[PDB]
Design a protein around this ligand. Structure first.
Ligand SMILES: O=C(CN1Cc2ccc(-c3nc(NC4CCOCC4)ncc3Cl)cc2C1=O)N[C@@]1(CO)CCc2ccccc21
Length: 342
């Protein structure tokens, strides 16, 4: 078997000529020549079976992405594993290989308004489909938006994704949360478990602001610092928005802060298109009930050149399927990956 940077890659025979790409908690990723389709692909080796939280991320990633089929959502092309549960130590997930991601692009490149518009359109078109299946991505951020050489965009990493559950959304003040800090809606720190579609729209709002200036809009260094960066720009919540926060610890925290005025978007973003800033404002609304929805966002005048609801598909049916053990999640992973065996 091939090795890459001191790791076995048991992807053959089909997948050969393996170049390293990168690495994280998830595992390792390489490009590989796919000998059946005659194209290089991404393959990420997951070795999750000794941690039930990595097994959860693996099952979510595989189950959701095999159900979903959409031009702006990364697919799974193939999955490699051993022929039995016992011999299965790794899972290789094969996906279309993409040139870069929006994180890398923003650290190096100025985006034209035309590029910003097209990226935003694609994010929302993928998100329309995600949300139509009653799913929340819950970790939208520039590194989870893959880009090819002609700026086609695909949303990736569904390991935190959930079915939406807005009747179980309420929680207490300062409840801990897993998704990336800078893209967390203000309600996460106040009274929300992050089980509504409006969580994803906030993150998209954050991404949009970041495309306008190549800097994160709300770069909090710790849990509550994130709300204070948010309130620094949006200003103090209105009476009406506060009355919606019935939790007293959260309410009284907000009432304790000195009055802060709204920083106008056109002063933060002097070179931005005014329609982009109108849509930004609606995505970065403090009150999640007042926040724009994905379909309204698509219909916003900023995206008029692209908007076409007939060419913005939805899922044919809602998605469905939990503190289960590592060993049962392994079984589920084995069942879900069977279609790729000879
Ligand atoms: O799966 C991920 C996250 N990952 C990691 C990852 C690397 C690579 C690419 C990729 N990259 C390029 N191209 C790159 C060229 C260089 O520039 C950047 C772009 N093309 C195509 C692809 Cl699918 C995509 C991903 C991705 O979704 N986590 C998961 C799910 O939460 C799995 C299972 C698991 C277990 C524990 C914890 C996390 C996770």
């Amino acid at each position: 078997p091939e090795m890459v940077r001191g790791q076995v890659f048991d992807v053959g025979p089909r997948y050969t000529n393996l170049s390293y790409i990168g690495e994280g908690a998830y595992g390792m990723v390489c490009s590989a020549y796919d000998n059946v389709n005659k194209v290089r692909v991404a393959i990420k080796k997951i070795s999750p079976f000794e941690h039930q939280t990595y097994c959860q991320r693996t099952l979510r990633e595989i189950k959701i992405l095999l159900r979903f089929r959409h031009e702006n959502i990364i697919g799974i092309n193939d999955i490699i594993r051993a022929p039995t549960i016992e011999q299965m130590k790794d899972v290789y997930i094969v996906q279309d290989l993409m040139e870069t991601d929006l994180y890398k692009l923003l650290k190096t490149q100025h985006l034209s308004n035309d590029h910003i518009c097209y990226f935003l359109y694609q994010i929302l078109r993928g998100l329309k489909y995600i949300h139509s299946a009653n799913v929340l991505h819950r970790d939208l951020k520039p590194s989870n938006l893959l880009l090819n050489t002609t700026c086609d965009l695909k949303i990736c990493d569904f390991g935190l994704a959930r079915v939406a559950d807005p009747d179980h959304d309420h929680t207490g003040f300062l409840t801990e949360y897993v998704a990336t800090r800078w893209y967390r809606a203000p309600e996460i720190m106040l009274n929300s478990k992050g089980y509504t579609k409006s969580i994803d729209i906030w993150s998209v709002g954050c991404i949009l602001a970041e495309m306008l200036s190549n800097r994160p809009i709300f770069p909090g260094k710790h849990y509550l610092d994130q709300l204070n960066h948010i309130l620094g720009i949006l200003g103090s919540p209105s009476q009406e928005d506060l009355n919606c926060i019935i939790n007293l610890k959260a309410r009284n925290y907000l009432l304790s802060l000195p009055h802060k005025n709204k920083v106008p978007w056109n002063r933060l973003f002097p070179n931005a298109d005014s329609k982009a800033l109108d849509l930004l404002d609606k995505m970065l609304t403090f009150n999640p009930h007042k926040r724009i929805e994905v379909e309204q966002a698509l219909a916003h005048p900023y995206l008029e050149q692209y908007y076409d609801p007939s060419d913005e598909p939805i899922a044919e049916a809602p998605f469905k399927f939990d503190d289960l053990p590592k060993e049962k999640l392994k079984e589920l992973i084995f069942e879900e990956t069977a279609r790729f065996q000879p």
